[PDB]
Subunit: 398 residues, 4 copies
């Protein structure tokens, strides 16, 4: 036994410690549909940062991480498509493939009460519900035949591992933000957020063939990653209206498509740039998206905030410019991305060299498992890095 | 001679008076593509009631009405598909058919500055912008070849005029609310609002083949029209939570599809049923719609409200349970319905006897022009009637 | 042990005989995802008739039937959503729920080589591949958690069993024919074929809210079932062009939507009505579907015909009016219906009393297992009945 | 003065001659909505070649050409969105924007009898019906406000005129072939045909973000344009089966998406590569497209062929492997592309430098009007050029 893991102990308190080796069981029942993986690469996410800041509650002693790439080392008796030694991508959604929502390709909202008895959605490292994260040496994956995405050729895949470690979550998430917003060839896109998800949303928009892709953020170092790769950027510390700043880049003060890659810990614009306000990103999108336009919201919004900037935000009640948005007949999509719907196509785009701008924009930094809390802390302070943990040293060395 | 019209003079002050006969002209500019209509039937809407209550601003002297069925009596030089004497349905949307949005079947948000120099949307009787309403003996209609839906068989159409008078606005609007929420055969649907729009949404859902259609309203008289036609109804004055009341009908406390047929003058639930709350209908739908579900919002929400219930609502900023909604990966569609997308199909459904229940749920009452301000008053006090004005005594049905 | 089954022995040679009790195994491997069902109701299909006529090859000793409703009597260790005693519907598609096509809600074309190693599709009673049919007392169903549709309340379901026995195959198939052809409220539909599938396609079109639903067939007794239920019919023995016959019913010589519920054993029109010609139904649809229209093809077309009317038809090569069809920018959908995509919604439509015309149109006749060959023979001679076998006498007696 | 035009006089007999200057008139009827254009650039198409070879009938004296970019020099009374001097792109589709099909964004199949009194479709230079082609100094364009795509920045547009001259027809057509086949990011695509249309399909697929784009042609020169730009190519003169040749490139003998950019004058494969067979491209796609896949057919197929290779082909009856296709549940889209649906977006993609590879694959050659019949002759003998006529010396690019 022995599994070294990133374990939650409290607000900004993460401890790398050895827990028992994962068994093929959940809630004291054998899972013959499940596999154990030896973790190849495992990233740190802005969703993990919500937990780290104490803005998303998990039980003390919960293992974090939901961006898993690994190798099958053990399987139950009902795993018929995965072999020991297979290199695979794990979607962050824990989904059964057997319930109504899974059968209608809506694995983002799995209804199976064995995945989550208290709500219709599953996720690693979020306690949704009771699935250990993958910021560890090993991890249990239920429903392996449905869940896992095989990287057919190990050698082809490992040479692009820094790109393919994003297939677990954030590229499909950013891409989903774009697709649900109707981003297509020749579209004009504004993305709120230049964290790892927003930078993936920008890369997804380019792959989709968008004409003008503009990204806004208060963080100039994160934005520089994008503008160096040919993307248009807006510094949101500027006091001039966002519409006017778009108008200077585009020739029009409005965009076809808006993508919210920020979430509930959003900040304001201009002199509000250092003020946390949960309606900051949303209301800016309602403002800049044109009549007949659409909005995707990959950024997380919670039904409960344990430490909100106002009382309403504590119950997920936000103060939203709905009337303005309604008048423009804007369409909105929300929620966890159904990674299973996009992961295969996005992998094909990477392996066939369609995304050379992805690594340029992502700023991947490979760290060890012991270095992870330092990574979280650096990320918490606005680092322009995407931290990827290599718990077995399988990624050579740079 | 003069054109007798319903004219707005102030809050709850409408006057049936003569206005100069309509010319084929707008802002002194000659309209080659336009037509004059002798009005056959012209309805009163909940949207007109917003104006009537002083909650939607139009200028003093503005002619009201946007639910027009009429006969062509005059045509400009560039009208090739309409003849004098043709019975037509007018979409409430003023739309050119020539701009980008119109060309992409989005006539709800016409971008033509000659239709509306400011916002991207056109509509009769809402000053959007400067198009006179059709609650009158005669009405100007621009871009006639694009705008108008001609009933091929005039006599057949006239025998179903009480159903077809709804083709101008509220049937396509309610139907759009359903379609945009993904209402399809076997669907479970909750509709907020049992006014004429909500009743048309219910009729549209039946036509779509929905399994279970539930309509909620604080108004009992309005709900009984639906009850008597085999629709499920919830009395929103009841103290019990809506989810549980839905549970009692359906067997599940959640629906596939939510339709908001109320708008910004919404009231609360149970003990707050006599209290106005602009978030009342929206938050109820965020609650009762299932994970993976969808919402259509045909009810109007405005960017500005002159007499709001709180200061935020004055600028169309609502307090919405966006977190609850987001967690369920719910999709939302908003805005004026693009009537042209649905009016032909819905006409065909009526003409071929697919909607016998429509007249049953609608409670059409036929009045004269002189009776119109009395119609508005009864409607404003919660009347279960759908008022249809007959300016030239052309209906004589009852 | 002991399982009395309809067994194929040759052209028009079916023998009811007792075979070994089904085990939870396939190709000498244990299936822990599978269940054994005690068969409640099991229908005879026009697809079975292809086998019976010797036009679709299965091995001698193959058990026929793919329209299964049953009760779970045994389950493997990885069946987590189905309980012993559950009343369930079995989609005719054998699908794994784990391959790429199944994950993208395309269970009609399962790629799993354990379902079918030789082609990307699975089906009971077709040797696709090696899955015994369900015209028997018991039947094995693989991948039970993904495959099966639970009828939650046994008592509610059994009172509608004559309707719900169609949920396994032909209602979803006919409905799929309509949906893929864009049948929606107010549509004008022509359906080729008034066998059980075509009569389900007509019932599906009504549920969808179609304005005019016209069905064509040479068989007048099958057509009478439809016209007695308010549908429009065309006798294809008539020598007048189909377009003109539609024009007499509709007012236009063309329809929005065409549905091919015939297949490769099609007959001609007029004096060709008694001549078998595999392009008979298809070319008629290419003729009567309007510009911008769409066609659904639920009727089976084979890549190999062992006894064709011409040499080309032996290799599935048909002589098709493609140019005529191309010029009208018509869209075509083909293939086995993905029953899993429609079965739940269609069940909801039945249980909520939305389809009272279905039984009126279907002409269900309940027979015993020993009476099955007589049923096949009667069906072969153009019987207007839908034969449903009750192998345990669970359907009372009429 | 006279309008110098390319005029059809018979098979392989075109004459550059003067014709009466265009009036704002059609069938002696005055056109308020129409415009006259001074032609900036006007291309030669494969569709013009069908006419040139005597395979598509037009009357003697008909003016050819339907790939028009021009400047507005005259406008009727009802043209409100175009000004004199405006640089515009003309969709090859003649479409009113006022009929049911046009109003539903289906301008490929305009139903207006004033556009075409017979079939539901309009096009310049194809006698559909009686609209003169744009291979001339001047051209009449009806319904200008609906039809025309105006380039906002005239100078910017002119600097990319060699790319934008394709916006009238072949780029939107090839792009439509891809989109209708479901080409999206990560897609594997096979395109039949490396003429200018097939090359635009390839460029469109790249813009869409396809992983693997394979183009087949018997013509090596035409394929090399694609090869040099990093596209995969298959020499169709090779004896090996196409599936296996695809296997060698892709790793699978099947593609997600098939595009037929050839049409009814298709040739065979391998040893039959110099043999004309109207089913050659279609059957290859029925073979190489996977189960659950889709096909787009931008290549023209006609209801009547005056010089067919067999009697069936004379009435547009083709011998198609429909059985093979059906078994794979493949979807098919056909017909003239609705250019208006794509032209704005594709323009935006060009203007924002998303298509540097377009000029690389297209091999634009600029010729004068006098050189046009020589252009047709070289093109007819398999030239890898895309011929663009410059009637007033307005391009001067090379
Ligand atoms: N839906 C899903 O499938 C799912 C999966 C993964 C991540 N997420 C979410 O995506 C979000 C993005 O996280 P991340 O990993 O990119 O790191 P992040 O949280 O650091 O990114 C947010 C960025 O947005 C910027 N920002 C703050 N206010 C803004 C505003 N008003 N307008 C524009 N930008 C603003 C911040 O400076 C920050 O750089 C998180 O909320 C995370 O929870 C959702
Ligand atoms: N989108 C469009 O194309 C468009 C077109 C026409 C009308 N509309 C809008 O539709 C809305 C309804 O129109 P109407 O003619 O039925 O007017 P209406 O005002 O008479 O109908 C609203 C009904 O909703 C009920 N209600 C109030 N609060 C509720 C709640 N919280 N939950 C459920 N029901 C509640 C009221 O009792 C009332 O009967 C109006 O806001 C109107 O402006 C929009
Ligand atoms: N795609 C699927 O999911 C799947 C599933 C089940 C059944 N099917 C197929 O559906 C088809 C229908 O079978 P069925 O069970 O209704 O019984 P059937 O085979 O008897 O029905 C065919 C009917 O069409 C009539 N017909 C013959 N030529 C015609 C023509 N040219 N135009 C119009 N009608 C014509 C016949 O008289 C006959 O009544 C069969 O081919 C079957 O294989 C496909
Ligand atoms: N749908 C539309 O909107 C529309 C518009 C424009 C053009 N088109 C049509 O598109 C087609 C192609 O146009 P083009 O300008 O490229 O003309 P083209 O004739 O020069 O291109 C056809 C190419 O296909 C090749 N070919 C022949 N048989 C083949 C096969 N079996 N498989 C693969 N390739 C094969 C030929 O060698 C040739 O290079 C024409 O039929 C044209 O009429 C349609
Ligand atoms: Zn994440
Ligand atoms: Zn699930
Ligand atoms: Zn209204
Ligand atoms: Zn417009
Ligand atoms: Zn069947
Ligand atoms: Zn499968
Ligand atoms: Zn062309
Ligand atoms: Zn038209």
């Amino acid at each position: 036994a022995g599994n070294k893991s990133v374990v939650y102990h409290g607000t900004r308190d993460l401890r790398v410690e050895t827990v028992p080796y994962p068994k093929l069981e959940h809630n004291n029942r054998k899972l013959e549909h499940a596999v154990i993986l030896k973790v190849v690469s495992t990233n740190i996410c802005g969703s993990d940062q919500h937990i780290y800041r104490g803005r998303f509650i998990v039980p003390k002693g919960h293992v974090l991480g939901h961006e898993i790439t690994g190798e099958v080392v053990e399987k139950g008796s009902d795993v018929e498509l995965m072999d020991i030694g297979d290199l695979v991508s794990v979607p962050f959604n824990v989904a059964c493939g057997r319930c109504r929502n899974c059968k209608e390709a809506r694995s983002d909202v799995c209804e199976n009460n064995l995945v989550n008895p208290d709500a219709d959605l599953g996720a690693f490292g979020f306690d949704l519900k009771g699935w250990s994260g993958g910021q560890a040496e090993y991890v249990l994956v239920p429903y392996a035949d449905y869940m896992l995405l095989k990287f057919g050729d190990k050698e082809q895949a490992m040479e692009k591992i820094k790109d393919l470690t994003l297939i677990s979550d954030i590229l499909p998430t950013g891409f989903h933000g774009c697709v649900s917003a109707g981003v297509k060839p020749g579209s004009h896109v504004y993305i709120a957020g230049a964290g790892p998800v927003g930078r993936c949303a920008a890369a997804g928009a380019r792959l989709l063939g968008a004409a003008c892709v503009i990204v806004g953020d208060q963080n100039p170092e994160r934005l520089k990653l994008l503008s160096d790769a040919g993307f248009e950027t807006i510094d949101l510390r500027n006091s001039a209206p966002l519409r006017d700043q778009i108008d200077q880049i585009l020739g029009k003060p409005e965009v076809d498509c808006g993508v919210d890659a920020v979430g509930f810990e959003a900040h304001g614009l201009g002199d509000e740039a250092n003020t946390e306000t949960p309606n900051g990103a949303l209301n800016s999108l309602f403002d800049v998206v044109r009549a007949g336009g659409a909005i995707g919201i990959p950024g997380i919004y919670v039904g409960s905030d344990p430490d909100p900037v106002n009382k309403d935000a504590g119950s997920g009640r936000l103060h939203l410019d709905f009337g303005k948005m309604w008048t423009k007949s804007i369409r909105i999509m929300t929620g966890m991305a159904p990674v299973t719907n996009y992961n295969r196509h996005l992998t094909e785009a990477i392996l066939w060299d369609q995304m050379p701008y992805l690594s340029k924009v992502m700023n991947i930094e490979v760290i060890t498992l012991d270095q992870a809390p330092d990574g979280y802390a650096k990320f918490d302070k606005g680092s322009p890095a995407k931290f990827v943990i290599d718990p077995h040293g399988m990624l050579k060395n740079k």
